[PDB]
Structure 1
């Protein structure tokens, strides 16, 4: 019945990329779009549009991957090598502003819901706020 649709979403993606794939379709959500908006806007995907599979709203999310490689196992590098959720439904993980993590030395992103919209490690540090550290992506 899904408990955290988000960790799901993210997993949907983690699994998607593993074999590389046009897109994958998380079921729609005004928060999942939100989260997704920051993947594309930060360049982890091509993007997403609404769709449907018989009355049921989803999100076609078009992935992104690296350039074909040489040598054995010529599968591309991954645009998203790692995406694991922080705050979980069984342990909400909140953070003040000075506590906010520094993913991978700026190379990654700490998406995180806040009192003024879904920001990120840099975005929130600027606006000077905090909130439920949603997850770390790189």
Structure 2
């Protein structure tokens, strides 16, 4: 059974870029949407729209890449270099505000989920809150 939604999402995204897809479908949800709101907002991905996939509601996430390389194997610098659920089910990891992690000397980001909204590290720290640390993307 699908055990972890978000991980499946993140993982659909990774698994795509690696093979360089223009876009990737993914079952939709009032949260997976909120996370995706950030990926676009930050710039890891072009964007996303609600799409009817065989009667079922999906999210077309529009992947983004870098330019065509020189010399041999011109597979473009990936925009989303790294991405992984930090907090997993059966191991949910919550963090205090003073405890929000800096990512890649601050270059990547961290998506949490606060009682105030799905946030970035920067925004979280600005708001003075913390919570379910969702994933590391950089």
TM-score if structure 1 supplies the norm length? 0.98
CA deviation string 1:74-132 (max 9, x = no partner): 11000001001100012000000000000101100100111000011100000000000
Identify unmatched segments of 5+ residues in structure 2: none
Number of aligned residue pairs: give it.
138
Structure 1 position 53, deviation (Å): 1.6
Q: In the TM superposition, what is the alpha-carbon distance from 1:11 to its structure 2 partner?
A: 0.2
Cα-to-partner distance string for 1:44-101 (whole Å, 9 max, x where unaligned): 0000000122210000000000011101111100000100110001200000000000
Secondary structure of 2:25 counterpart: strand
* TM-score normalised per structure 2: 0.98
Corresponding residue SS for 1:51: strand
The 3-state SS of whatever aligns with 1:122 is helix
Q: Does 1:77 align with 2:82?
A: no
How far apart, CA to CA, are the structure 2 residues paired with 1:111 and 1:13? 16
Which portions of structure 1, spanning 4 or more consecutive aligned residues, are displaced by more than 2 angstroms? none
